């Protein structure tokens, strides 16, 4: 009896197992347009009753910090996503689109007119980190432009419109990327957010942006079609908080309150294990504390294996387990976990390259 293969009711969606495709930027969506290669890639990994989360997807022309990542802010993008969603649904899978704004984790080369990226702050990511450039070299993260509250409201509207576009494309739902030092995390983390207005200072103020984003998408598409990803403790892009557990619990409280207000539960809360990068006990403590505090479905992610995923579900630490790197190199990861079959190695060199086949769809099945 493998606990990963017991069914699970994720709100309206009846899942047949607990193995989730974690959202992974792969950079094959040339010119920000979903391509046929994405259809092949997601189709390979789809299973009947399995849940897939897409690569981060742009909500606006200013939201990108990687090359050739898809958007869902134009009608052309919606039309191409629909073809991908249809082939995934034909396999019986459930698929959510992750909505992603990078904030300050960008570069002039990724911005319209070469403008500065936006953030909560004018503080740049430090020179300890370098950004992948379209030519494969690495560049300098620039100083971002700190946005005012009118512009904050327009970014919230970008999330809302992108959620509606995702539904128009046929997605079952969306995930808010609120993790990993990206735009939402630049408001959450007190190591980044140095604002003195209503969006900074107190923990309550720092949580305002994520609350408004989640509220907007819930109001647009329904809470049961909205997942939220956060990472209160993460070593990525200078995104630290002085009190990660209290930050996490404050976010959880806002989500619990949104659910009570809306009269419905979110699809899930998705949290990255602090071990994941691009004390072992304090890390598991943080995860279980957030799970125990949240009134709903919990997806854990970051460094999971077959054994660690089985343990997480068996022990009640998570309802669903998302896998990233092993899903890159094992299109049939679900079946391999079921059979306890050996897994293929992954090649980091082709994680972010543009080839529609090599290192993308050419990892073999059993
Ligand atoms: C190539 C790659 C791209 C990723 N892109 C995203 C992304 O777009 N959005 C996101 O929330 N996480 C992203 N992550 C993190 C994954 O969703 C996931 O949490 C992580 O890979 C899980 O750890 P694992 O690889 O040990 O399974 C990415 C990870 C990898 C390896
Ligand atoms: C290390 C935490 O950050 C991530 O996992 C991530 N996006 O969220 C990427 O790596 C983008 C390619």
Author numbering: 9 to 286, 297 to 384
Authors' account:
To assess if the introduced amino acid exchanges affected the overall structure and the binding of the oxime, we also crystallized the tyrosine variants in complex with selected oxime substrates. The protomers in the crystal structures of the tyrosine variants are perfectly superimposable with the ones of the wild-type enzymes, confirming that the exchanges did not lead to major structural alterations. Interestingly, the binding mode of the oxime substrates also did not change in most of the structures. Interestingly, the exchange of the canonical tyrosine (Y190F) did not have an observable effect in this experiment, indicating that fast protonation in the active site is feasible, likely via a water molecule. On the other hand, the canonical tyrosine variant OPR3_Y190F showed a 2-fold increase in kred and an 8-fold decrease for the NADPH Kd. Though a parallel 2-fold increase in kox is also observed, the Kd for the oxime seems not to be affected by the mutation, indicating that the canonical tyrosine residue does not play a role in substrate binding in this enzyme. As an additional aspect of the crystallographic study, the structure of XenA with 1b might explain why only XenA efficiently transformed substrate 1b, and OPR3 did not.
The biocatalytic reduction of the oxime moiety to the corresponding amine group has only recently been found to be a promiscuous activity of ene-reductases transforming α-oximo β-keto esters. By studying the crystal structures of enzyme oxime complexes, analyzing molecular dynamics simulations, and investigating biocatalytic cascades and possible intermediates, we obtained evidence that the reaction proceeds via an imine intermediate and not via the hydroxylamine intermediate. To gain more insight into the reaction pathway, we determined the crystal structures of the two enzymes OPR3 and XenA in complex with the oxime substrates 1a–c, either by co-crystallization or by soaking. All the crystal structures obtained had a high resolution (1.9–1.35 Å) and showed clear electron density features for the oximes.
